Write a protein that binds this ligand. Structure first.
Ligand SMILES: *c1ccc([N+](=O)[O-])cc1C(=O)Nc1ccccc1OCc1ccccc1CNC(=O)c1ccc(CN2CCN(C)CC2)cc1
Lengths: 10, 269
């Protein structure tokens, strides 16, 4: 879940 | 007494809801009832008015370059869904304690939650005969969506069916803010590691939601109960929505699903 992970950290 | 903290929570949520979701129910109803005297949405009932409405609705998201109507509409719908997920995610971050949860759980709550929330988001844009598109610039009819070829003709109907029932509860943005937070923090999602801190936060939100509904809708009784029963139906209803999308991903070579949407539909139920 690279994008979902990325939206949550950024 | 401790109600003040729940009222504070409800307002904190409404304030971040306003920041996260540009098109509110208030604006959508204003447009749908003509309360505001901005120029009405361009109504789209068929292939021809789809074509004629192109100045206002602006289906230019196919920018490598086009295809049959069903695909162009579905990708229009798909585009907005991606942004909806970006919005729900920002809103989740504002829910107190959520970002302190395990990042796998953050992901899992959103993975299952977004779909349930999107159905509620569509309701705000809907009446019995159609849906607002292009940030209120357009209005696509329910008949037109139905009349599309399979598998696309039945994609939006379940949302229309739900929307008719859901909108009858006559919730506003301040109710919806807390309702969305409750959905996101369900501790019975598949594959959750730490259920306890999810359930602790959700305890507060349901208390906040119960209070809000009594204060904001004192005339209307068992609204809290009516609302939880919808929330449980919603979970049931989303299991069909996932299956139709598997088919579209696997069958329709003309188009493709946005990677993000592939993440949230992957390995679900
Ligand atoms: C629809 C299809 C598939 C999925 N899915 O794969 O999960 C999801 C949906 C969906 O849920 N849509 C949705 C969720 C929440 C809120 C609104 C919607 O979509 C409403 C809808 C319904 C039918 C057709 C279109 C739409 C909304 N889309 C548009 O209005 C639209 C999108 C994109 C454009 C082009 N833009 C390019 C960039 N700049 C220039 C603006 C215009 C125009 C209109």
């Amino acid at each position: 879940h690279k994008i979902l992970h990325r939206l949550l950290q950024e | 007494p401790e109600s003040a903290d729940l009222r504070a929570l409800a307002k904190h949520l409404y304030d971040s809801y306003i920041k996260s979701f540009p098109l509110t129910k208030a604006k959508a109803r204003a447009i749908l009832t003509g309360k505001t005297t901005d120029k009405s949405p361009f109504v789209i009932y068929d292939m021809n008015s789809l074509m004629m409405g192109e100045d206002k609705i602006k289906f230019k998201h196919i920018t490598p370059l086009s295809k049959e109507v069903a695909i162009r509409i579905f990708q229009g719908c798909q585009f907005r869904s991606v942004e909806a997920v970006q919005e729900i995610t920002e809103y989740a971050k504002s829910i107190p304690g959520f970002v302190n949860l395990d990042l796998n759980d953050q992901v899992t709550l959103l993975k299952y939650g977004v779909h349930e929330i999107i159905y509620t988001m569509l309701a705000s844009l809907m009446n019995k005969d159609g849906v607002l598109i292009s940030e209120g610039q357009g209005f696509m009819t329910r008949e037109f969506l139905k009349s599309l070829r399979k598998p696309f003709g039945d994609f939006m109907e379940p949302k229309f069916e739900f929307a008719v029932k859901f909108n009858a509860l006559e919730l506003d943005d301040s109710d919806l803010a807390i309702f969305i937070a409750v959905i996101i923090l369900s501790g019975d999602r598949p594959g959750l590691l730490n259920v306890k801190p999810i359930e602790d936060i959700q305890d507060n939100l349901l208390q906040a939601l119960e209070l809000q509904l009594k204060l904001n809708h004192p005339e209307s009784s068992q609204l809290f109960a009516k609302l939880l029963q919808k929330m449980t139906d919603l979970r049931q209803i989303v299991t069909e929505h996932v299956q139709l999308l598997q088919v579209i991903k696997k069958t329709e070579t003309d188009m493709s699903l946005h990677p993000l949407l592939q993440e949230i539909y992957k390995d679900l139920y």
